[PDB]
Write a protein that binds this ligand. Structure first.
Ligand code: SPH
Lengths: 272, 47, 246, 246, 47, 246
């Protein structure tokens, strides 16, 4: 259907037996009472489109995902800057994605790198994706930066932002943002269940970045990750969270200081 | 606006205070257009 | 499939749970005036969506010492909404009516109501004087009560000298609190003239009289309202001129 | 012929007098795993008479200051009967469930219950601390309550930060004490993996929350129990090994 | 064994003590064999 | 369309609102005596409009410490009306019977009644004496109570040494105050002889025994009557002679 719905011409009824406005809500179903079984309507040929409300047009937005700092000092230097790939770091795309239970999609990661004061000097960077199980690079001159049997992107700061496409690589058939279980067997404590809700089917490796040079470069870069979902399929729709987020991998909320879903009114017998 | 048509009559030995649950949905001619950001979240604590 | 009914007229709807069968007055449906019976030459207007809808009046608390209430139906909707505005500007008028009287209670209350219509329900003065200058006559608020309504003084004689017992010949319906909570009557246009002024002539009038008194045990609810809804079906108007109030 | 129903699974039967229509979750019936979607090589066992039957849990007294109760369904039947024994010995598990919640009262009691299922119902810790070592997390008896059950602390947010109002998208049913006394939901196997361990992963969980509080006049009964019966429809087990408890 | 599933709820101004009558019969596959004497009567007074 | 019934026999009618299905005793309808089974030579009379009608007996107040009542049916209508007069003048008699027991109450009363018929309901004397001259025997007002009725002393043994529990083999019906308010049994002529005297032999007898006691809260009605109506279907009389009383 390319349009929403057309309206049939209706009229009045004067007869017993037909009750379309007495739909019982105790059955768990939604009231199917239309306008034609009610106040007299007319013939309207609606041609309003429904294409924008689809899932592929709703999840085709990039949004901010990760912010990675790279100081590259001279005396307190590290060289590299890894970033665990997770979507729960910023509450916008998290709120947009946690309204479903199971999802399956592809990615269009984009990397925007700027300096501290803001300046595009021609410094070439190396963006490395470390899959889960591969060793992480330790140092700006490590052995792992050879990128043999490992995908990496070489780009400068004066160049346009890099953009790669990422397939679906979870060992399960779909992702999940809510895991009602435990990752392994054993006795689970009563004090602090810090492993509850953890899903090993979402650890998508680690993302590292360094500056390709010989000695050093006294510059503090700041990379931003923009992930565009595509080819997305969602299952089991879940309600939208009404409480402020507190942690990344845990949906914890405030016991006291609760936020009501609707703001307060003057009286119940007042519309304004 | 929900008005009282006749009354809420109640027999003896019966509580005289009830409640009404209001539900809401959309019909088949419901249409949406022009995607934007919500205004239910403006700031966020560093996670 | 008989106790439930949803009446839809315009942009209003009335759902029911405890209902009897709908009453069609004199077996005739309210329709438009044919060309054979009509007498005016000007073309009448027919909104059919703006005046044909359920208008809800006020509610009256059914007490234990209640006598009854009545209404003049072409005069109650004389000032409420598009129907009243359209009837003030016009000289001629012809329509039927659809009624619905709501009165709900618990399964521990008892009582019965007699709701019926009386064509040309003439209010009679109450007194024993035969001199022309002192013979009691009802006031304008008694003959035409408006959107509020009027109460009975002697409901045993219908305030007209005719006994309430014999008033079962009219199109009537009972509201027995153990059987149903509503009554529905569909009455067509009943008059000896095709069109008529809806300002200085009421065709018929509803009356509600509690035959069995309201009884309940100490502990139940005490406020029992009487709500009435009216749908002016198949309305016609003619003779457009200045708007007059009364 | 719609308000009466007799569900028969195995050697158990549930008769009813006041019932609404049965709810089929997401319009899908619980069936066996096909060869296209399956991934294990060993042949799974199917008792079909010893684990597919109605198991009745305990009853909880519905008081006036009650908040609500919830359950982890692949973890409640983890120790009760042939189903629990067969699930302790096996590593893989896949089945649907048939539910029935009993709550009867007189025609003088009022109240309403919201019984629904939530796939992957994750319990959230309650606190305002962001430090990793002191951030509150629910205990094992709170995440997996067992055959007994757990109560809500903030049932307005479902103990998960999601409002109870928006929880009507789930397969749900109402228990209105003036309409019915039971609710029935048939839910299939809902997971992103074909088989899964029924010990360290609960697929979904029932929740019962009284939206309208229980009210009655002084003189009626005061003990209103909440009884739940569950039938593990179309059960499959794989990976036979030693029996583990938790 | 007859257990309490939910409860026996009762409205006000109503007795809160009911009764259940238990009946018993046999199905169509009911079968009997080998006739003997009953043990409901062992002695008897001379009539 | 099953809970309502109107039985019409002669110039009487019984309407009902709360009814179960009608009971036909032993699956046989009461008919006239065929020529193969008959033995008398004289032609029997058949009024078919004057004796075949509903006769209503008195009403008995169902108290809380009530045991039960019983009747000898060919002896209750032995003196009431055209049936009794026609039965006093004749020596032979053969008819069936149609029964109806009325007992109404509110939706706040509880109780149950067991109404059934027993062919050859023999009253047993109550005592522990075996000497022939002092062995207790029931009087004539106890064996044949007449149009009034008789009460039970030990209703657990049906006043005959047979337990009330096993009395469900007879054509029976229950009056549960939450389900129905009447019971209806149609019994044919059951005897080992074609015709028989309706004066010194009662074929069967009704018995009403409250199994569950009558209970109610302080404030409701306290007078609960027990009314019985009997229709002597398909009556025949033979051997016309002088009228005898007993
Ligand atoms: C060459 C550098 C590429 C940088 C991007 C890394 C490629 C792998 C990305 C996998 C896409 C995973 C999207 C989200 C996965 C899980 O749901 C989250 N980790 C949990 O929220």
């Amino acid at each position: 259907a390319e349009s929403a719905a057309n309206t049939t011409p209706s009229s009045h009824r004067l007869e017993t037996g037909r009750v379309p406005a007495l739909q019982a809500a105790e059955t768990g179903a939604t009231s199917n009472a239309t306008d034609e079984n009610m106040i007299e309507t007319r013939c309207v040929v609606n041609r309003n489109g429904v294409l924008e409300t689809t899932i592929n047009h709703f999840f085709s937005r990039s949004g901010l995902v990760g912010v990675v700092n790279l100081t590259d000092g001279g005396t307190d230097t590290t060289g590299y800057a890894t970033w665990d790939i997770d979507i729960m770091g910023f509450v916008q795309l998290r709120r947009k994605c946690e309204m479903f239970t199971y999802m399956r999609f592809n990615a269009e990661f984009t990397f925007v790198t700027t300096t501290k004061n803001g300046e595009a000097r021609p410094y070439m960077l190396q963006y490395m994706y470390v899959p889960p199980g591969a060793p992480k690079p330790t140092g700006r001159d490590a052995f792992q930066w050879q990128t043999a049997t490992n995908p990496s992107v070489f780009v400068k700061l004066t160049d346009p932002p890099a953009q790669v496409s990422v397939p679906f690589m979870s060992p399960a058939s779909a992702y999940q943002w809510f895991y009602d279980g435990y990752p392994t067997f054993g006795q689970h404590p009563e004090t602090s269940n810090t492993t509850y809700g953890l899903c090993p089917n979402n650890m998508m490796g680690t993302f590292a970045v360094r500056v390709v040079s010989r000695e050093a470069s006294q510059l503090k870069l700041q990379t931003r990750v923009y992930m565009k979902l595509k080819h997305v399929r969602a299952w089991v729709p879940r309600p939208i969270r009404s409480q402020p987020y507190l942690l990344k991998n845990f949906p914890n909320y405030d016991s006291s200081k609760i936020t009501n879903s609707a703001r307060d009114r003057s009286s119940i017998k007042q519309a304004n | 606006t929900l008005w009282y048509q006749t009354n809420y009559v109640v027999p003896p030995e019966t509580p005289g205070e009830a409640y009404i649950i209001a539900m809401g949905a959309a019909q088949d001619n419901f249409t949406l257009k022009i995607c934007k950001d919500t205004d239910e979240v403006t700031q966020q604590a560093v996670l | 499939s008989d106790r439930v009914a949803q009446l839809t007229v315009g942009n209003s709807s009335i759902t029911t749970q405890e209902a009897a069968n709908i009453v069609l007055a004199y077996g005739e449906w309210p329709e438009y005036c044919p060309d054979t019976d009509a007498t005016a030459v000007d073309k009448p207007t027919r909104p059919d969506v703006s005046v044909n809808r359920f208008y809800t009046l006020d509610s009256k608390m059914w007490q234990e010492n209640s006598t009854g209430w009545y209404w003049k139906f072409p005069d109650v909707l004389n000032k409420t909404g598009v129907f009243g505005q359209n009837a003030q500007f016009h000289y001629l008028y012809r329509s039927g009516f659809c009624l619905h009287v709501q009165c709900n209670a618990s399964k521990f209350h008892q009582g019965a109501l007699l709701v019926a219509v009386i064509p040309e329900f003439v209010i009679a003065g109450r007194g024993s004087n035969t001199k022309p200058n002192e013979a009691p006559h009802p006031g304008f608020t008694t003959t035409f009560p408006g959107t509020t309504g009027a109460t009975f003084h002697d409901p045993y004689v219908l305030d007209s000298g005719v006994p309430l017992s014999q008033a079962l010949i009219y199109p009537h319906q009972w509201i027995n609190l153990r059987t149903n909570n509503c009554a529905t009557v569909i009455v067509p246009y009943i008059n000896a003239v095709p069109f008529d002024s809806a300002i200085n002539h009421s065709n018929f009038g509803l009356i509600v009289i509690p035959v069995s008194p309201l009884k309940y045990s100490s502990g139940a609810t005490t406020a029992i309202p009487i709500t009435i809804t009216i749908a002016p079906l198949n309305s016609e108007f003619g003779g457009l001129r200045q708007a007059v109030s009364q």
